[PDB]
Structures are given as structure tokens and as C-alpha cells.
Write an enzyme that holds these catalytic residues in place. Sequence first.
Site, PDB file in Angstrom:
ATOM      1  N   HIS A 191       0.820  -1.223   0.000  1.00 18.37           N
ATOM      2  CA  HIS A 191       0.000   0.000   0.000  1.00 18.37           C
ATOM      3  C   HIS A 191       0.859   1.281   0.000  1.00 18.37           C
ATOM      4  O   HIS A 191       0.460   2.320  -0.517  1.00 18.37           O
ATOM      5  CB  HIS A 191      -1.024  -0.046   1.149  1.00 18.37           C
ATOM      6  N   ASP A 195       0.267  -7.557   1.606  1.00 16.28           N
ATOM      7  CA  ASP A 195       0.708  -6.176   1.679  1.00 16.28           C
ATOM      8  C   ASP A 195       2.215  -5.932   1.753  1.00 16.28           C
ATOM      9  O   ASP A 195       2.700  -5.250   2.657  1.00 16.28           O
ATOM     10  CB  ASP A 195      -0.042  -5.482   2.860  1.00 16.28           C
ATOM     11  N   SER A 201       3.842   1.885   8.960  1.00 16.56           N
ATOM     12  CA  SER A 201       3.622   0.967   7.832  1.00 16.56           C
ATOM     13  C   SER A 201       4.972   0.558   7.244  1.00 16.56           C
ATOM     14  O   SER A 201       5.771   1.447   6.974  1.00 16.56           O
ATOM     15  CB  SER A 201       2.786   1.652   6.751  1.00 16.56           C
TER      16      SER A 201
END
Length: 242
Positions: A72, A120, A195
Site C-alpha cells: 500500500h 501487503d 507501515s
Amino acid sequence: EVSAEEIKKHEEKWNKYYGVNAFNLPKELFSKVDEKDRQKYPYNTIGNVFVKGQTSATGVLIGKNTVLTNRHIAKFANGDPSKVSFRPSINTDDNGNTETPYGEYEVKEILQEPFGAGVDLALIRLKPDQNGVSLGDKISPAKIGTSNDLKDGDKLELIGYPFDHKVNQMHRSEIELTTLSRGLRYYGFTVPGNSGSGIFNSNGELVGIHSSKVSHLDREHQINYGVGIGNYVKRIINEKNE
């Protein structure tokens, strides 16, 4: 469906990370990585993945010219490498002094979803510096472990750049594994910039990459979600790492 006792206990734990102010969190659960530790392994394998005017997150140097981060995060570049930069061990103190001890690296290629659109993770390949020196020659890449032996209750270290808390300041977060039947799930303090943060075991091996927060137990509660370096992921990394 889960018992009302679980939602109560979950809320109990969760709240010990998000119920009190970030700055008021106990050092054992969340702390800034000092200069001394930043120059050592595994901390020096952590870098800031910067996508010009889109986001600022984390990445882990796993190869001589390879960085593992989230799919992402990589999508913010739209396949365009010139839009992403990697800054290993970058640090900006509270007074605006920014230091990049190993310099800043440009990206030559983004592999957006080499593990599949529902995993991801993405690989970022870096160019060597202007002298042709690769980042992995200055710093040893992270050792890749496996997530196969992890178990409920396990404690691990998540290292990354919690942008929303402090800009360009590496922090470590103690995380606690939970119901691993539904993927790598854990209690711990994180923000959006984490992240792509690395998750390391006591042996200093990389066992997972932080992704985000997902619903948990019911549609109204949350838990941190990460991607474990399992059999499949390991294979793709051995195949495309460099």
C-alpha cells in the site's frame, strides 16, 4: 462471534497502548532509538521510505539494493521510481537538525505486488550511490527469519518511523502476538507511518513487516496487522532479492 468477556479484555489491553498519551506511554512499550543503538544491527537496517508529496513510511533493507515495505505504501508512487526515496537511519531532532549518515538513495525499480495483490508487501530496488556503492555494502541487510514458529502471547520488537508521532525519529514498539490463526495480529502502539516497520525476534531476525490496523473480534474493535515472513513470502524474497 466471541464472548463479551473477550471484547472487554481486548479493550483492556488495547487501551494500555491507546488510552494514554503517546508521550506518556511507558518506555518499555514504546521508546525512541538513541544514536548509539541506531548505528547497530538491527536498527540500522531500518529506513524511511519517502514518496514525494504522498507519504512517509518505513522500509527494511533486506538485500544489497533491496528494501521490503508495504504494497500500500508503494502504490503511492504509481510505478514511478523517481517519486520514492529511501533514507536509512535518518534522524531529525526536535530542533530540525536532520542527519542521513549513509546518505539518501534513489529507487531504480518498484515491484508493487510480487507476492500477490492480497499480500501487503512490495520490494523496492535502490540505485547505488553516485560512487556506485550499494547501501548493502555500507550496512549488512536484515537477516530473514520465519514466522512459522511464532505463537500466541509472543513478544517481539517492531522498529520503524512513527511519522504521525515524531517526524524522522526511529522508535521501537514492544508488540504482543495474539490469535495468529487469522494472520500476524498483535497488540502494540503504532501509527500510519509505522507501515513497513520491521518486526524482529530476540535472535535479531526479521519475522514480519507491519502493515496497518484491521477490525478484530467484531466489526467495532481493532488490532494491529502485519505480514509474516512465511514459507511463501520467503521463497519470493530468495527469488527476487538483490
